[PDB]
Symmetry: C4
Subunit: 349 residues, 4 copies
């Protein structure tokens, strides 16, 4: 059989910068469009935004701010079990807010999850580099066996088979993203990945049959990228780069060449794991001030995009929005071009 | 839901994706007719309209545009009395054609009343999303009150949106969602259609009704205008190539050692405040001098383009011009390459 | 609505979109014949013709081109008696082949007569749009007066334009609408055809009548010439790669301590002055020294390319060479990449 | 008729590394468990699928020794006399009985050079040639096969399936693939000839698999992932030049420029390599200094173990037979690299 040999270069993939959402007939204005989403009966968000579970993006201060904006924060796992549990307890104490927590597939995974459940965590995130492995499938089933009502967010994946395997394993939400992270080099050092917009659409196609929402994680650089991800099947997007520069994110502000910056590094980089083979890099990000100003520009772009597509809710955007593919020349026409920009826009660069 | 499996079926082309195919020509570029008829009371000698923006078109720009055979749309970022006076100023300047921009607001009727009493030739019901029930209901209200007033409705980018505004009374449909040089709509909202596909798709629906379409935004060089008109557009609307003109509002300022003019989107922070999630940027463009020199280069490129395609009038070019798709390597071959340019060209900058 | 539905059906390819597929070879590059025959009265030892531009070819350039085995086209930006003097000087220098470019004007016949009296080998009815009735009628007008004169009519880029000029009496058709390095026709008028497709489409029609086509413009490296010949062209025309040559008109101008020479398009403002809507730009090119060194690299790169394709002569390459289409990433792989070039090569600048 | 070749001129399409991505599949193995061993022949088995290029700025005695101790193979370049190369191969074989190869051109002194290398206990000779689909190369492969029936013969370079079949029938045990993809190469620019390397590897492996012949993916590998893509395209082993030139074991000394250390890396077809008139098919340049070879090899093998772990491949045969790609645009390439973040520190596998 040579079926696998002749199908190597058949599939095509698309990313955010390859398409545009086609405007449709609209009766609702951006001001009166609903942006709420339901990941599960216990996890309902006012805005479809989740801060990434990374050591440079989300701790308690970011999770508290995210939940108060209507979103969700994922406490990273690069800390002790008692430390992460103390932050989850700190968030839910500060007004009864939603909070998540990252958990790696390891031997101490169950012990870490036990402390988080005692801290009344709302969703554990079994985050790993390859969600389509048997070790993750087995560990997702163990958490469902011990905690039948616990929200399990499993990732990351990029194929329909992987999403189908995790849904059977007990995952309530499937996080899609293999490569697109702004600080990610997995596609470069390992050669493996799927274009994110095609990855979200392929995984959502399988997950919508079982009523399982998916999380588009990584690759979102502008507000429009989020609208393209949600319109491709995602119930919610996870952001890392666009949340690293906010004031509430962990770490202090640094001065470089006079301007204020913040440290943003991938969890697979050398510094974050402290002879290792990294799949991420360490970098800096401009300080953008408080989170409220960044969230406002994100939801504002979503409300504008939903107003164009005639979507009064994120379900109509998920079921009716149509894309149109474009070339590189179409992308340059989409951005500003042939004009010397004088000052900064709050929602562009 | 068949919509799910068809999400990524469509393809869209822009100006830099295609080239006009040269055909047999019995007419010289000097002998072609660039005239265009948009309605029974609106006929332009050149297919050029200056955008209704606070850095592009006012009284001085509209007067100059009409003297060249074009049309000028006075922007709406001013009081109703100030916009009506500039419309009257253009009309008393030799009987020139003039337009005015009106937003789809509750005071739109009050603004239109002053413009029609100022003998405005056309009103542009300009908004971000033309395919909304608010625009459809507004153009019908203007149609009922003024059955003979020319109504330009936009912006749209689909055939269904063009059908909605035509059947709602609009005489001309303006096409362009996201192509503007100062526009970030496709970036912040992720919504748009590649302009040449948008013009062609909208022109296909409007051609059934005998309705002209305006190609608005995305035109960086004079050749892009020839592609837009060949894709089905009766007339193009320019903003970037008109802001560096002396007749445009604002004064000259020295930047990068050269003379520059302020050019900003009407959806940017500065324009929305002087007349918050924006959909445009604030920038500047090189100073190009009087409008006469710029218009001559634009029309000259169109006359050359129509001469290559063998089109005597704009109808032949609209109905017979053929394109050919090219890659990015074709775009770099189309521009100058591997030669360090020493002097400016009047139709090619940098 | 057939014409309305077929507007965006055609697709064109240029040099940087393809590569020549290497084939079985029994001949070495040095043993390969590169001679070409454009007519019984015009055979060239090398498949190279210098462009008829005021900054590329005059008397001294045509002599050096002919003694290398090529051909020079004396441009038309000079008096009628001055051009006949230049054509005479080339024939006075050993009976060499020489051409002259004339425009489609009322004095075209008056200019051609003075050049035929000078025993010109080929007249070149150069034109921005060769598919015009004025060009077609003037080809019949010149052919009826000179049945034995070689007429190079252009420029065209479609098969229907090639056929229109052939039956008009033109025995050689020059192909190129837009690809010139100094050309802005595709930018100011929006009209053009990718040069590789334009040559292929014109060669397909011209080969039915045994008419050779000239690949004019768009050739920046020696490999682009091999692709143009492999597309069906008998000979290529160069302007940029011959402008920096000492034999080209004008003396050397210095810029940042380096030797340069002015290279401008015949449709640029400066060339036509010797209110105007130009289709070309004015620029400079690095001084490359004598023509013999540039031709050696060009013909040398052809011998290798013909060796890779197993072509003994230019007829086998025109009839058997295969291309393979590549993406922009293929072009980046084709050039040197991820290495800091320290020395400039004689054929790669 | 005769218009068959005329109408099929622009039909083929080619893919390179930056055109595709490996599609992750279900995996039961961890990257530390995967087997990276490969068998070009029973007398030439490499523990890692890495071969250093036979160039005067990449591989000599010190590099070939270091490559073999990591489980790879070094190809001694041919820009030296017969006694020098025979002694260079002898120096590697004396240094613990390590595997070593040597480059031999298709010339009159070819048999004289090969006889000195076979006596030096060489394990594989490489008929390195700009165009491997020539009759002189085909004749010279048969000539070596007739005299040394058990000698490993590596022939190249080719980029089509019919060329691969011609080299196999001539007697070559391994076929090198790569016409144009080299980082220092200008063949595709000066001669316009070539095939995108990932498509060339796939087409040549398709023909070579029918004869049970391994294929070497030569050239174009810029990062660790490009090797994984080349092996997943059907190649048994990859050959690297740019990613090995800046290694401390490479020939030549280091030079400091603006604080950073560099090392000269030039193509064999360049002027400088042929000098010690000419129409070159390569350029001369410099690459960053990467220190000892062990640090570069560790990242290469580490990235390969990660890719196979993503693809669910325990061995390299599973990756050759089962790995599926997905094609992407230039906008997919920018998403694959880091983006919109100012890199502050240099990663050991990404610069
Ligand atoms: C890319 C990201 C996000 C990242 C984040 C932090 C760190 C990493 C690092 C850099 C450590 N690389 C990584 O882990 N590579 C990898 C490659 C292939 C596979 Cl198959 C796996 N498998 C996973 O580890 C082994 C088992 O635990 C298995 O169950 C689990 O799936 C992992 C990478
Ligand atoms: C893009 C441009 C040119 C621009 C110009 C000035 C300002 C704007 C701003 C930045 C204000 N953004 C905008 O208005 N966004 C938008 C998005 C979706 C929709 Cl659905 C609508 N609907 C419109 O507003 C509500 C009703 O009045 C409705 O009738 C009308 O269609 C508007 C943008
Ligand atoms: C592009 C090049 C090479 C070039 C070179 C020098 C000068 C030019 C200029 C800049 C002058 N532009 C030009 O001429 N534009 C053009 C456009 C359309 C047509 Cl249809 C034609 N028609 C031709 O001119 C009128 C008659 O002579 C007719 O017979 C003939 O076909 C010409 C351009
Ligand atoms: C591209 C590389 C790697 C390279 C490396 C060093 C040097 C070269 C040079 C620059 C010398 N160019 C080269 O050799 N060009 C070439 C082109 C076509 C053919 Cl057909 C051949 N044929 C070969 O030479 C003639 C006969 O020996 C024949 O048997 C053999 O196949 C060679 C290039
Ligand atoms: O070190 C890394 N290697 C690979 N992926 C990473 C790494 N760190 C974070 N990610 C992923 O990338 C996402 C952030 O994407 P961003 O918004 O583009 O920065 C995270 O939520 C993770 O899914
Ligand atoms: O701020 C804005 N946001 C989005 N589009 C705009 C804005 N202002 C003007 N436009 C559009 O852009 C056109 C001009 O763009 P340009 O001529 O390509 O630079 C105008 O005629 C409008 O259709
Ligand atoms: O100014 C001009 N406008 C358009 N095309 C030109 C002009 N001048 C020269 N050309 C064309 O460009 C060719 C040379 O371009 P090059 O060889 O690519 O640099 C000439 O032989 C002409 O066919
Ligand atoms: O000068 C040359 N011209 C063309 N290819 C070359 C030349 N020199 C080396 N190569 C090839 O390029 C390979 C290495 O390329 P790299 O790994 O991409 O830098 C070598 O193993 C050779 O196959
Ligand atoms: K834009
Ligand atoms: K050009
Ligand atoms: K190369
Ligand atoms: K990435």
């Amino acid at each position: 059989s040579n079926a696998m040999w002749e199908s190597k270069f058949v599939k095509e993939g698309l990313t955010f910068d390859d398409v545009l959402l086609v405007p449709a007939k609209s009766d609702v204005l951006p001001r009166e469009v609903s942006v709420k989403t339901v990941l599960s009966e216990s996890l309902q968000l006012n805005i479809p935004l989740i801060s990434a579970g990374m050591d440079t993006v989300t701790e308690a201060d970011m999770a508290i701010a995210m939940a108060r904006q209507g979103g969700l924060g994922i406490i990273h796992k690069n800390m002790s079990i008692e430390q992460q549990a103390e932050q989850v307890d700190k968030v839910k104490r500060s007004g009864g807010l939603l909070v998540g927590a990252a958990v790696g597939v390891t031997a101490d995974a169950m012990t870490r999850i036990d402390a988080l459940v005692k801290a009344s965590v709302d969703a554990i995130v079994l985050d790993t580099a390859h969600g389509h492995s048997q070790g993750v499938i087995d560990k997702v089933k163990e958490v469902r066996a011990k905690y039948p009502s616990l929200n399990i967010i499993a990732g990351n994946v990029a194929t329909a088979e992987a999403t189908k395997a995790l849904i059977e394993a007990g995952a309530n939400v499937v996080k899609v993203g293999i490569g697109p992270g702004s600080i990610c080099t997995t596609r470069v050092v390992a050669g493996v990945g799927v274009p994110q917009l095609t990855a979200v659409y392929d995984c959502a196609t399988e997950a919508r049959k079982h009523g399982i929402p998916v999380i588009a994680d990584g690759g979102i650089k502008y507000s429009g990228d989020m609208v393209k991800a949600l319109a491709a099947g995602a119930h919610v997007v996870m952001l890392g780069s666009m949340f690293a520069g906010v004031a509430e994110s962990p770490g202090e502000t640094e001065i470089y060449q006079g301007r204020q910056f913040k440290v943003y590094r991938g969890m697979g980089s050398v510094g974050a794991m402290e002879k290792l083979v990294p799949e991420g890099i360490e970098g800096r990000v401009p300080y953008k001030g408080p989170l409220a100003d960044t969230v406002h520009q994100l939801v504002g772009g979503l409300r504008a995009g939903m107003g164009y597509c005639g979507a009064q809710d994120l379900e109509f955007l998920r079921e009716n929005a149509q894309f149109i593919r474009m070339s590189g020349a179409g992308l340059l026409e989409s951005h500003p071009h042939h004009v010397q920009i004088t000052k900064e826009a709050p929602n562009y660069s």
